[PDB]
Design a protein around this ligand. Sequence first.
Ligand SMILES: Nc1nc2c(ncn2[C@@H]2O[C@H](COP(=O)(O)OP(=O)(O)OP(=O)(O)O)[C@@H](O)[C@H]2O)c(=O)[nH]1
Ligand SMILES: CN[C@@H]1CCc2c(ccc(O)c2O)[C@H]1O
Ligand SMILES: [Mg+2]
Lengths: 338, 359, 56, 224
Amino acid sequence: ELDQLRQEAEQLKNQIRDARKACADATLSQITNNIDPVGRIQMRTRRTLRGHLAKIYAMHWGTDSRLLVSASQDGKLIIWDSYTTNKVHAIPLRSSWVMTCAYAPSGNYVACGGLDNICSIYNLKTREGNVRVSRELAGHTGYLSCCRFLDDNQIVTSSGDTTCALWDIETGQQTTTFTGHTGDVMSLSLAPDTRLFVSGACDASAKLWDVREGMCRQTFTGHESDINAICFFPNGNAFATGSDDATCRLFDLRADQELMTYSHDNIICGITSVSFSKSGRLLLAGYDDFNCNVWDALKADRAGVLAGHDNRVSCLGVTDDGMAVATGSWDSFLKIWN
Amino acid sequence: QRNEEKAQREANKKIEKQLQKDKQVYRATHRLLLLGAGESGKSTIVKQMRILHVNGFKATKVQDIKNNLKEAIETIVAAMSNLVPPVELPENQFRVDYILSVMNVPDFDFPPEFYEHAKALWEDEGVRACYERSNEYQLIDCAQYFLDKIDVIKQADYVPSDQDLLRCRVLTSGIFETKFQVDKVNFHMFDVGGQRDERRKWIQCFNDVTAIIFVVASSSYNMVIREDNQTNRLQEALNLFKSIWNNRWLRTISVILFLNKQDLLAEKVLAGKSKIEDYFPEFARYTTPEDATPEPGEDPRVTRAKYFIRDEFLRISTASRHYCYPHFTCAVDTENIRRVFNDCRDIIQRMHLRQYELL
Amino acid sequence: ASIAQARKLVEQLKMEANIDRIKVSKAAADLMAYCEAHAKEDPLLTPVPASENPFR
Amino acid sequence: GMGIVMSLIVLAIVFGNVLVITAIQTVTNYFITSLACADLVMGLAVVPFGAAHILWTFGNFWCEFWTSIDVLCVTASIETLCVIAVDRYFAITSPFKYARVIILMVWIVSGLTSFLPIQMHWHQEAINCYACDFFTNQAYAIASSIVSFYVPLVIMVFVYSRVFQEAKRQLQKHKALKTLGIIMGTFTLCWLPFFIVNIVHKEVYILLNWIGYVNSGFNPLIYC
Ligand SMILES: Nc1nc2c(ncn2[C@@H]2O[C@H](COP(=O)(O)OP(=O)(O)OP(=O)(O)O)[C@@H](O)[C@H]2O)c(=O)[nH]1
Ligand SMILES: CN[C@@H]1CCc2c(ccc(O)c2O)[C@H]1O
Ligand SMILES: [Mg+2]
């Protein structure tokens, strides 16, 4: 019966926790207490991009680290030119509620999600110099939360129906399907080699799926509240998480354990987005207290503070070459730091 | 080459001109959000508002009326074996097994054989006895209207009327939105209708709507939620109203309150049967407030019941920038909605918002 | 029905436990080694010259 | 040396007006900019007047320029408050409404009507002045006084009454009286006595003008 089965499930959880204790040899701080502090970090707004009418919900950088795409709550995607602050396109939308955007590695397609359950995909370079909807993916229920590109013909989504699927633009059908979460899926991030990806659920848990096989590998549950953003270390063997409470942690794959916790006693707000740097030394993290913060990956101390949006930070990103840092906000403003 | 720079600047100028032109429309629109519990009547208002102010408001539609008729007749007959007290009726005994056989099938009984003997079951005395107590089992609210209209739908070329389209029930997946214009000004109203969720993490997106419309059923006080034996169907709405009202994001948003199914409530009180005091024990000591404005045709007995529901909802709002507007509506009556919205608009939410600097 | 659901959950959990792990000391050493190698090629830590900066 | 204290005191009027100007945004906020800009010009006009009482009139042709500037500034401020009152009341009274050019209209009306004649040059005592006392006969005042104070007050008295009535009815479906008093009493007490004094046609009349220049300065705080 269920009582016998429920006993077996509890008879295995203790084994996981007991085995994890034996793997712990020393904390991260003990092995990294003999390095020089980075020091104060200060950088100013090099450029400001304006033209949106409502709050920005997401953004993504191009592969060449020159073009970027942003999505707003009035249903407009616009592709900026970072160097000269010149708009290139302005795409109207069928539905005015949009939560995500993406930019293909080859720079030929732009995909936007939304609450309309449709992961519509656009085309950039084509005849007549016009932009039209290429395909619409509608086999999925619940509002979407992220979209990513593996190549020109594969896109991964994640919605609030406790499901993540890998699509196929040409055929327009779900190739695989990942299940197992007990809450809404909020964000995901692809590995540097595009072989694995993770997903931050709403029940204070994070998994590690496999693109080919389609099964869950591990599960980390060190948090105590909602999870809002995830990003990978540039190495590909660790990932940082930004939760609803002020804590942002850093897990490991091989060690299968949580390593360091980033928090301060004077912060009681939420977390919106996180991102690393080129060398994986800094951990930028947005906040809900009208500005941003810069932590350290090893010393775990706040170095510098980025402020000036006058409204909550809703998205964040770092270019491929690590030359600039871009942030969005809810007051129709984008900024570039350096 | 400066030609590329000139072309890029020209494109930027064109895009800026288009954006400046489009900015005017966005600032001149009012956005409204519907809310409430399931099976309350949210989508009916959206469909009706199209007919009132837009000219455009069918073969595929005629399928779901037939679908509604099949579901209602199957539920009433098949649920009798599940009622604990026996009220068993021998007519159509060979047809009861037929209904059970067709109770589960992807393809409906399009053949005219099913329609012929289905009328007898509706006219059977046992079914009417079973229908008399519909609180125990879950039944569609449009059962009586369609069952009596079995003769019209049988003939070919049905061409259903607008009134018959309003009482149809079709589940909605995505955003149900409409865009109409009232005189010079224009409006934009959108449903949500995703699925029941205790968290509702998408409530952050609606942080700038002018008003939130709340719709609650008033004739369902002796039924349970779809999850059987959960709670009183009215008590599930009261809990939802309190959570929405006391939310961090919706801190400066007014709420318009609608109480639908007034005709259903009026009929329930008149013909005895279940009493409110059985389910709500505090109603026994209630006294009608002095500032009462009953409708001319309303009997004195039913006017005491209308204001008890309104008081329960209003007490939560007044306990804790915010305002609440009560109303009495009947979504089916086409002319009825055409007056409340107008009167509600009269005392504009906007005048109050502008009056904030000094009253 | 649900019992199957509990049957499927325990089947998945068993394969997760039989996984290889390494000590934290041999794991935390690699991350510290990685950051020191790629420290030079990071224009965010060490400020770039105005000539090399494309944004100014 | 009381004049130095008074001259230094009115020098503080430029402080607050500049800070409001520095902050600098909506459709109505553009109209409120005009009032602040004109008042700051007031400090330059006030300083020559204060020194003249202390005793000058160094400029034979510059004596009239100060009078023209003062008249233009006063009429511009009065017209600006009339415009803002009319705009607010019309917007509040009629819901669902369906700027730079307008502020320009009132400024064009002021600069012209209040400066053309004084530069233009359009009795025995006046002849003595020609050899910085201000002497107009000919009812120039009737046009300037009527077109710069009564026409503006008459518009302000009507729009504000309708707006307060619409405020008293909505509670039926206090602070309003206090705010309306703060808006109206200052302007009335600071300008209407001067208008009464001018129409009588000298130390008293000069004294009333000296008392009234500050009211435009206090204006930045009440509107802000
Ligand atoms: N008799 C009567 N029926 C009504 C009235 N208002 C709504 N109904 C019917 O009751 C049902 C209400 O459900 P819907 O119209 O689907 O609205 P809803 O339940 O809010 O929709 P969702 O919750 O999004 O599924 C429909 O069958 C309506 O036709 C009313 O005043 N009187
Ligand atoms: C005190 N200096 C002048 C004197 C006369 C005068 C003023 C303002 C408006 C008028 O219509 C006037 O006739 C004053 O500013
Ligand atoms: Mg619906």
